[PDB]
Protein backbone atom coordinates (compact mmCIF):
# COMPACT_ATOMS: atom_id res chain seq x y z
CA UNK A 1 0.00 0.00 0.00
CA UNK A 2 1.76 3.08 -1.33
CA UNK A 3 1.10 5.88 -3.83
CA UNK A 4 1.96 6.17 -7.51
CA UNK A 5 3.39 9.47 -8.78
CA UNK A 6 6.42 10.86 -10.60
CA UNK A 7 8.54 13.30 -8.59
CA UNK A 8 11.31 14.67 -10.82
CA UNK A 9 14.48 13.96 -12.80
CA UNK A 10 18.04 15.27 -13.05
CA UNK A 11 20.68 15.04 -15.78
CA UNK A 12 24.05 14.42 -14.14
CA UNK A 13 27.01 15.35 -16.37
CA UNK A 14 30.40 15.18 -14.67
CA UNK A 15 33.77 16.64 -15.67
CA UNK A 16 35.24 13.48 -17.24
CA UNK A 17 37.46 12.31 -20.11
CA UNK A 18 34.97 11.84 -22.94
CA UNK A 19 31.46 13.12 -23.50
CA UNK A 20 29.49 13.92 -20.38
CA UNK A 21 26.61 11.51 -19.93
CA UNK A 22 23.23 12.89 -18.87
CA UNK A 23 21.90 10.14 -16.62
CA UNK A 24 18.33 11.04 -15.72
CA UNK A 25 18.56 10.52 -11.98
CA UNK A 26 14.90 10.27 -11.10
CA UNK A 27 12.69 9.92 -8.03
CA UNK A 28 9.29 8.26 -8.24
CA UNK A 29 6.36 7.41 -6.00
CA UNK A 30 4.88 3.96 -6.63
CA UNK A 31 1.97 1.91 -5.35
CA UNK A 32 -1.82 1.75 -5.51
CA UNK A 33 -3.02 4.83 -3.66
CA UNK A 34 -3.90 3.95 -0.07
CA UNK A 35 -2.68 6.91 2.00
CA UNK A 36 0.81 5.69 2.90
CA UNK A 37 2.70 7.79 0.37
CA UNK A 38 5.94 5.96 -0.42
CA UNK A 39 8.47 7.78 -2.60
CA UNK A 40 11.99 6.78 -3.50
CA UNK A 41 14.99 7.88 -5.58
CA UNK A 42 17.26 6.38 -8.20
CA UNK A 43 20.40 7.03 -10.26
CA UNK A 44 19.56 5.79 -13.75
CA UNK A 45 20.85 6.49 -17.20
CA UNK A 46 18.89 5.98 -20.44
CA UNK A 47 16.23 8.43 -21.59
CA UNK A 48 13.37 5.86 -21.78
CA UNK A 49 15.08 3.43 -19.40
CA UNK A 50 16.09 5.69 -16.50
CA UNK A 51 12.51 6.13 -15.34
CA UNK A 52 12.24 2.43 -14.55
CA UNK A 53 15.91 1.97 -13.69
CA UNK A 54 15.44 4.73 -11.11
CA UNK A 55 12.07 3.50 -9.85
CA UNK A 56 14.02 0.26 -9.34
CA UNK A 57 16.01 2.09 -6.67
CA UNK A 58 12.98 4.07 -5.50
CA UNK A 59 10.95 1.01 -4.50
CA UNK A 60 13.90 -0.45 -2.56
CA UNK A 61 12.48 1.54 0.35
CA UNK A 62 9.25 3.49 -0.09
CA UNK A 63 8.08 5.19 3.04
CA UNK A 64 4.89 4.86 5.09
CA UNK A 65 2.49 7.67 5.97
CA UNK A 66 0.14 6.50 8.76
CA UNK A 67 -2.69 8.59 7.44
CA UNK A 68 -5.54 9.93 9.54
CA UNK A 69 -8.00 9.78 6.65
CA UNK A 70 -10.44 12.53 5.84
CA UNK A 71 -8.06 14.98 7.45
CA UNK A 72 -5.43 15.14 10.13
CA UNK A 73 -7.74 17.06 12.48
CA UNK A 74 -5.12 19.40 13.96
CA UNK A 75 -2.35 21.49 12.41
CA UNK A 76 -0.14 19.03 10.53
CA UNK A 77 3.44 19.96 9.66
CA UNK A 78 7.03 18.80 10.09
CA UNK A 79 10.66 19.67 9.56
CA UNK A 80 14.14 18.36 8.85
CA UNK A 81 17.19 20.60 8.50
CA UNK A 82 16.34 23.41 6.08
CA UNK A 83 13.16 21.64 4.89
CA UNK A 84 9.61 21.95 6.22
CA UNK A 85 6.03 22.66 5.19
CA UNK A 86 2.79 23.42 7.01
CA UNK A 87 -0.84 22.37 6.69
CA UNK A 88 -3.70 24.16 8.40
CA UNK A 89 -6.75 21.85 8.32
CA UNK A 90 -9.75 23.30 6.51
CA UNK A 91 -13.10 21.94 5.38
CA UNK A 92 -12.95 18.91 3.05
CA UNK A 93 -15.78 20.32 0.97
CA UNK A 94 -13.47 22.85 -0.67
CA UNK A 95 -11.99 21.10 -3.69
CA UNK A 96 -8.23 20.72 -3.83
CA UNK A 97 -6.30 22.97 -1.42
CA UNK A 98 -2.58 22.85 -2.12
CA UNK A 99 0.60 24.72 -3.00
CA UNK A 100 2.94 24.75 -5.98
CA UNK A 101 5.05 21.57 -6.01
CA UNK A 102 3.06 19.75 -3.31
CA UNK A 103 -0.11 19.71 -5.43
CA UNK A 104 0.07 16.15 -6.74
CA UNK A 105 1.32 14.67 -3.46
CA UNK A 106 -1.63 16.38 -1.77
CA UNK A 107 -3.76 14.16 -4.03
CA UNK A 108 -1.60 11.14 -3.15
CA UNK A 109 -2.64 10.70 0.47
CA UNK A 110 -6.40 11.04 0.54
CA UNK A 111 -7.22 14.00 2.76
CA UNK A 112 -7.80 16.87 0.30
CA UNK A 113 -9.16 18.97 3.18
CA UNK A 114 -6.13 20.76 4.68
CA UNK A 115 -4.34 23.60 2.95
CA UNK A 116 -0.66 23.65 2.03
CA UNK A 117 1.21 26.51 3.62
CA UNK A 118 4.16 26.09 1.26
CA UNK A 119 7.03 26.91 3.63
CA UNK A 120 10.62 25.71 3.73
CA UNK A 121 13.91 26.47 2.05
CA UNK A 122 14.64 27.03 -1.66
CA UNK A 123 16.63 23.80 -2.10
CA UNK A 124 15.28 21.47 -4.83
CA UNK A 125 16.63 18.13 -3.58
CA UNK A 126 15.56 19.11 -0.08
CA UNK A 127 12.32 20.42 -1.53
CA UNK A 128 11.49 16.72 -1.35
CA UNK A 129 12.75 16.86 2.23
CA UNK A 130 10.53 19.84 3.05
CA UNK A 131 7.57 18.07 1.45
CA UNK A 132 8.02 14.69 3.14
CA UNK A 133 8.83 16.28 6.51
CA UNK A 134 5.21 17.38 6.82
CA UNK A 135 3.74 13.88 6.63
CA UNK A 136 6.58 11.59 7.78
CA UNK A 137 6.39 12.52 11.49
CA UNK A 138 2.71 11.64 11.95
CA UNK A 139 0.86 9.53 14.50
CA UNK A 140 -2.80 8.61 14.52
CA UNK A 141 -5.36 10.06 16.93
CA UNK A 142 -7.04 7.12 18.65
CA UNK A 143 -3.77 5.26 19.11
CA UNK A 144 -2.21 8.28 20.84
CA UNK A 145 -5.28 8.80 23.02
CA UNK A 146 -5.00 5.13 23.96
CA UNK A 147 -1.24 5.40 24.51
CA UNK A 148 -1.74 8.29 26.93
CA UNK A 149 -3.37 6.07 29.56
CA UNK A 150 -6.87 7.46 29.05
CA UNK A 151 -9.49 6.38 26.50
CA UNK A 152 -9.83 7.50 22.90
CA UNK A 153 -11.98 10.43 24.09
CA UNK A 154 -11.37 10.79 27.83
CA UNK A 155 -8.69 13.29 26.78
CA UNK A 156 -10.89 15.18 24.29
Amino acid sequence: EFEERVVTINRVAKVVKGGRRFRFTALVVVGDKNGRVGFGTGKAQEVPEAIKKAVEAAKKDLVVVPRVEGTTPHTITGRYGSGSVFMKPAAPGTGVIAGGPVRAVLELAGITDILSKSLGSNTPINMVRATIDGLQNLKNAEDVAKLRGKTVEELY
Binding site: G95, V96, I97, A98, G99, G100, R103, S116
Partner: peptide, 11 residues
Protein backbone atom coordinates in the same frame (compact mmCIF):
# COMPACT_ATOMS: atom_id res chain seq x y z
CA UNK B 1 -13.66 20.06 -14.07
CA UNK B 2 -14.71 20.96 -10.54
CA UNK B 3 -11.07 20.31 -9.54
CA UNK B 4 -8.61 20.71 -12.45
CA UNK B 5 -10.38 23.53 -14.28
CA UNK B 6 -10.25 25.55 -11.05
CA UNK B 7 -6.73 24.35 -10.27
CA UNK B 8 -5.81 26.36 -13.34
CA UNK B 9 -7.12 29.25 -11.21
CA UNK B 10 -6.38 28.14 -7.63
CA UNK B 11 -3.56 25.58 -7.46
Amino acid sequence: NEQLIVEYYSR
